[PDB]
C-alpha cells in the first residue's frame, strides 16, 4: 500500500500525528530526510528501511506548537509563588530551614534507588534563638557539621530506610541539639 504521508496536507495539525513518543515511522513522517555515511559517489540512505533513523530518540512528539499547546493546558495545575518572597534575602528570613532531597529517574523494571533516602537540613545559627554560651556549645557539639564561613549548620541524615523517617530524624536532631545547647551541666564550669 502507499504511505499515508501522501495524504497529509501542508497545514495539518502535526501534534495529532505524533501525540506521544513513538519510534520514527517513515510512512508517517512526511519529510525526505536522509541518514547514513554515503558510499563513494553515493548519497545518504533514504528513510525507508533506515535503521539509523530508527535508533534516534526523535522529538517529533515535542514540536514548539505541541509544547505550547501542552503548556497552555497544564497551566491549570499550577500555583503562584507568593509575591512577598522577591529574592533570597526574604526567603532566608521567613523560612530559615532548607531541606534538600533528591530523586532519581532511571530506566528499568524497578524504581527503587537507595540514594533517595538521604535528607539534608541546613539552618543558619544566626536565625536560631541562641545566646553566647548556647552558640558556643552548639558549635562544639556539632563539630564539622558547622561551617564558620557561612554560619550554616548542615545535618545530613541517612540512617533510616525511608526519606520521611530521615526528615523526622533530622528535625529531632536539630531540636535536641538546641535544647542541650541551652542546658548547663556541672562539668561546664570546668572549662
Amino acid at each position: 500500500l502507499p504511505p499515508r504521508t501522501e495524504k497529509m496536507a501542508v497545514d495539518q495539525d502535526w501534534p495529532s500525528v505524533y501525540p506521544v513518543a513513538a519510534p520514527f515511522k517513515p510512512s508517517a513522517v512526511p519529510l525526505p530526510v536522509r541518514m547514513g555515511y554515503p558510499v563513494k559517489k553515493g548519497v545518504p540512505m533514504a528513510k525507508e528501511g533506515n535503521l539509523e533513523l530508527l535508533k534516534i530518540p526523535n522529538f517529533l512528539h515535542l514540536t514548539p506548537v505541541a509544547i505550547k499547546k501542552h503548556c497552555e493546558a497544564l497551566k491549570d495545575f499550577c500555583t503562584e509563588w507568593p509575591a512577598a518572597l522577591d529574592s533570597d534575602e526574604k526567603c532566608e528570613k521567613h523560612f530559615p530551614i532548607e531541606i534538600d532531597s533528591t530523586d532519581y529517574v532511571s530506566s528499568g523494571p524497578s524504581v527503587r534507588n537507595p540514594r533517595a533516602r538521604v535528607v539534608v537540613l541546613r539552618v543558619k545559627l544566626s536565625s536560631l534563638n541562641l545566646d553566647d554560651h548556647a552558640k558556643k556549645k552548639l558549635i562544639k557539639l556539632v563539630g564539622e557539621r558547622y561551617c564558620k564561613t557561612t554560619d550554616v549548620l548542615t545535618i545530613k541524615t541517612d540512617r533510616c530506610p525511608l526519606r520521611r523517617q530521615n526528615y523526622d530524624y533530622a528535625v529531632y536532631l536539630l531540636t535536641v541539639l538546641y535544647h542541650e545547647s541551652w542546658n548547663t551541666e556541672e562539668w561546664e564550669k570546668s572549662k
Binding site: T102, L128, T175
Partner: protein, 130 residues
C-alpha cells in the same frame, strides 16, 4: 479533523485543597546522557516548557565524564551532563513540570532532581525549655 470535532472535552479534575503548598527555593535537574545532541534537544524542550509555564530557569553544562578501561582493546564510556536550575516555584508547579519533563525523558537519559524545600522553625525551637 475539518468538521468532525469534539463538541465538549472532559478537562481533568484539579481540586484546590485547603492545606498549604510546599515552597521550593531551588530545583536542580541534572540530566545525564551518552549523546550531546539529545541533551541539547531536551534542553530546548525543557526551557521552552519552563518559559511557557512561567517558571524561572537557567541552564548550564557540568563537565563530562569519561570511563576508560582495557580488556589491547580499550573501551570507553562518555557521560555528558546538562543542569537546569529552576527557582522560586511552588509544590504544585514543581509536580506538574516534573511529571511533564520526566514523562518526556528520552531513552538513554537518566535524571537526578534535587529539591530544596523551604521550611520554618519548629515551635519546639522558638524558645528554650524551663
Amino acid at each position: 479533523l475539518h468538521v468532525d470535532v469534539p463538541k465538549d472535552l472532559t478537562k481533568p479534575v484539579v481540586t484546590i485543597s485547603d492545606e498549604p503548598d510546599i515552597l521550593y527555593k531551588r530545583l536542580s535537574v541534572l540530566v545525564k546522557g551518552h549523546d550531546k545532541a539529545v541533551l541539547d534537544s531536551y534542553e530546548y524542550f525543557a526551557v521552552l516548557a519552563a518559559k511557557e509555564l512561567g517558571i524561572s530557569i537557567k541552564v548550564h553544562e557540568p563537565p563530562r565524564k569519561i570511563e576508560r578501561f582495557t580488556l589491547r582493546v580499550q573501551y570507553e564510556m562518555r557521560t555528558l551532563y546538562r543542569c537546569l536550575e529552576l527557582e522560586h516555584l511552588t509544590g504544585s508547579t514543581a509536580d506538574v513540570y516534573l511529571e511533564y519533563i520526566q514523562r518526556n525523558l528520552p531513552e538513554g537519559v537518566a535524571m537526578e532532581v534535587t529539591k530544596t524545600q523551604l521550611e520554618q522553625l519548629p515551635e519546639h525551637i522558638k524558645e528554650p525549655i524551663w
